[PDB]
Structure 1
Amino acid sequence: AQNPNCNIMIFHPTKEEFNDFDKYIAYMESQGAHRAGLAKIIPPKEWKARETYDNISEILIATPLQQVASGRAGVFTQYHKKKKAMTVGEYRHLANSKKYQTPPHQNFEDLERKYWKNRIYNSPIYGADISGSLFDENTKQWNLGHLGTIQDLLEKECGVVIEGVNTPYLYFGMWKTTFAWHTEDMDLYSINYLHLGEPKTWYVVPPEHGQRLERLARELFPGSSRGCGAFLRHKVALISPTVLKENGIPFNRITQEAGEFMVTFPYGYHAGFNHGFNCAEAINFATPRWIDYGKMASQCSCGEARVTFSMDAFVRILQPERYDLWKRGQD
């Protein structure tokens, strides 16, 4: 079995290997990359996502989210308070202000220490989940707006034609902005490209050990657990590495820098934080290996998780027994 310790693997494809996305994902899996839940892909030196980032300031962040924490430093939840719209140029200035800027630090490890010590005492503002793309239309390799769609994969694998679309999302981050512990909708893959700015630190639990994380989360968030049998679908809970180590949960960590891709694999729980002003783009995708994960994915039916239009069909076709109850949660 390849990668039996479920370490995060880092790949350096050549320009020739960068042509065929599906084939390279399947290659990475042949080497065991999925066992970690997360992989890094460093693009060939010849590749670029677009020519420059000089003209992005007029993008609108219609609903910036202030991430307010409750709990203790290593075990907290966050809620998202909606703020007034602002442009990317306005947000960048805000991120760089004395109130919100990255503190002085020695290295990524010192910054990680400061994040876990101090996150809860601040409420950073995240421009998340903005439909759109920063890939140049002429970028033919690993262009996250030109991937094969999940609806077409389901149709190729299972023969059923379904409604829905699959488009990318932009994330504009600042110091301390935080992504809570989650897997993807329907336990899909994700791919994330860090277009610019400061790094993003990731934590990940191997898919084969995801239920260990779920059991800890039910212990640590006991009211949330009684409210919903899949409350990590709410994307609000954080647990620190120190706490994970104290409770014996297997995980790994890695820092993504500008110009790098990360792939999350089906049922790979992940969480993380931004180091400073940055912009990422991410999208879900599927492969044939996902289908079985999609069929077994948990679902939130309490009403909190509220998701896209396109998840309807996935539930309806892969999980027809759950469909009725899940749809009640969506309505």
Structure 2
Amino acid sequence: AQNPNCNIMIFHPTKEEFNDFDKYIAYMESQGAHRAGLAKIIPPKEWKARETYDNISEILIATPLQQVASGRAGVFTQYHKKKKAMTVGEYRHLANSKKYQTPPHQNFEDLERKYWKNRIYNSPIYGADISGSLFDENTKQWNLGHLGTIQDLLEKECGVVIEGVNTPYLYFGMWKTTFAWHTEDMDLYSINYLHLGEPKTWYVVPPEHGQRLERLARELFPGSSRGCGAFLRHKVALISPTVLKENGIPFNRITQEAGEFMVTFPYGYHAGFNHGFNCAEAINFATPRWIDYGKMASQCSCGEARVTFSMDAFVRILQPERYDLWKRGQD
């Protein structure tokens, strides 16, 4: 069995190996990369996503989100308070202000210590989930707006044509912006490219151990768990590495830098934080190996999780018994 300790693997594809996206995902899996839940892909030195980032300031962040925490430093939830619209140039100036800028630090480990000690005492503002792309149309390799769609994969595997579309999203971050513990919608893959700026630290639980994280979360968030049998779908709960280690939960950590891709694998729980002003692009995707995970994915039906149009068909075809209850949650 490849990668039996479920370590995060780092890949360096050549320019020739960078041509065929599907083939390279399957290669990484042949080496056991999915057992970690997360892999890093460093593009060949010949590749670029676009020519420059000098002309992005006029992108609008229509609904910036202030991430307000409740709880204790290692075990907390966050809610998102909507703020007034601002441009990317306005948001960058805000991120660099004395109130929001990254503090002085020695290295990534010192900054990680400061994040976990202090995060709850501040409310950073995140530009998340903005439909769009920063890849140039002429970038032919690993262009996240030109991937094979999940609807086409379901049709190729199962024979059924379905409605829906699959497009990328932009994330503009600042110091202490946080992504809560989650797996993807329908336990899909994700791919994330860090276009510019400061790093992103990730934490991940191997897919084979995801239910250990779920049991801890039910213990640590007992009101939320009574409310919803899949409350981590709400994407609000944070648990620190120290707390995970105290409770024997298997996990790994890695820091992504500008110019790097990360891939999350089906049912790989992940969480993390941004080091300072940055911009990432991400999209969900599927492969043949996903179908079995999609059929078994948990679902939130309490009303909270509320998701895209395109998840309807995935539930309806892969999970027909759950469909009626899930759709009640959506309405």
Provide the TM-score with structure 2 as the length reference.
1.00
CA distance in 2, matches of 1:303, 1:10: 38
1:297 Cα offset (Å): 0.1
2:201 aligned residue: 201
CA distance in 2, matches of 1:328, 1:65: 27
| 1:241-280 per-position Cα deviation (integer Å, ceiling 9, x unaligned) | 0000000000000000000000000000000000000000
1:318 Cα offset (Å): 0.2
Any idea what SS the aligned residue of 2:79 has? strand
CA distance in 2, matches of 1:208, 1:107: 32
Unaligned runs of 5+ in 2: none
Any idea what SS the aligned residue of 1:315 has? helix
1:248 aligned residue: 248
Identity of aligned residues (%): 100
CA distance in 2, matches of 1:316, 1:96: 45
2:231 aligned residue: 231
CA distance in 2, matches of 1:160, 1:102: 49
Any idea what SS the aligned residue of 1:316 has? helix
1:283 Cα offset (Å): 0.1
1:56 Cα offset (Å): 0.1
What is the aligned length? 331
1:315 aligned residue: 315
1:229 Cα offset (Å): 0.1
CA distance in 2, matches of 1:322, 1:66: 34
CA distance in 1, matches of 2:163, 2:52: 35
Any idea what SS the aligned residue of 1:3 has? coil
| 1:35-93 per-position Cα deviation (integer Å, ceiling 9, x unaligned) | 00000000000000000000000000000000000000000000000000000000000
Any idea what SS the aligned residue of 1:148 has? coil
CA distance in 2, matches of 1:43, 1:32: 20
CA distance in 2, matches of 1:73, 1:50: 39
Any idea what SS the aligned residue of 1:84 has? coil
1:228 Cα offset (Å): 0.0
CA distance in 2, matches of 1:92, 1:329: 37
1:16 Cα offset (Å): 0.1
Residue 100 in structure 1 maps to residue 69 in structure 2: no
| 1:111-137 per-position Cα deviation (integer Å, ceiling 9, x unaligned) | 000000000000000000000000000
| 1:262-307 per-position Cα deviation (integer Å, ceiling 9, x unaligned) | 0000000000000000000000000000000000000000000000
1:101 Cα offset (Å): 0.1
1:63-142 → structure 2 map (5 Å cutoff): 63-142=63-142
Any idea what SS the aligned residue of 1:204 has? strand
Any idea what SS the aligned residue of 1:18 has? coil
1:218 Cα offset (Å): 0.1
| 1:177-236 per-position Cα deviation (integer Å, ceiling 9, x unaligned) | 000000000000000000000000000000000000000000000000000000000000
CA distance in 1, matches of 2:263, 2:88: 25
CA distance in 1, matches of 2:139, 2:255: 25
1:265 aligned residue: 265
Unaligned runs of 5+ in 1: none
CA distance in 2, matches of 1:160, 1:97: 52
1:309 Cα offset (Å): 0.1
CA distance in 2, matches of 1:320, 1:57: 45
CA distance in 2, matches of 1:197, 1:226: 40
CA distance in 1, matches of 2:248, 2:303: 31
Provide the TM-score with structure 1 as the length reference.
1.00
Any idea what SS the aligned residue of 2:327 has? helix
Any idea what SS the aligned residue of 2:46 has? coil
CA distance in 1, matches of 2:295, 2:71: 34
CA distance in 1, matches of 2:184, 2:300: 12
CA distance in 2, matches of 1:70, 1:216: 18
CA distance in 2, matches of 1:88, 1:15: 32
1:281 aligned residue: 281
CA distance in 2, matches of 1:322, 1:104: 50
CA distance in 2, matches of 1:276, 1:329: 36
1:34-73 → structure 2 map (5 Å cutoff): 34-73=34-73
CA distance in 1, matches of 2:116, 2:320: 41
CA distance in 2, matches of 1:233, 1:227: 12
CA distance in 1, matches of 2:44, 2:242: 35
Residue 145 in structure 1 maps to residue 179 in structure 2: no
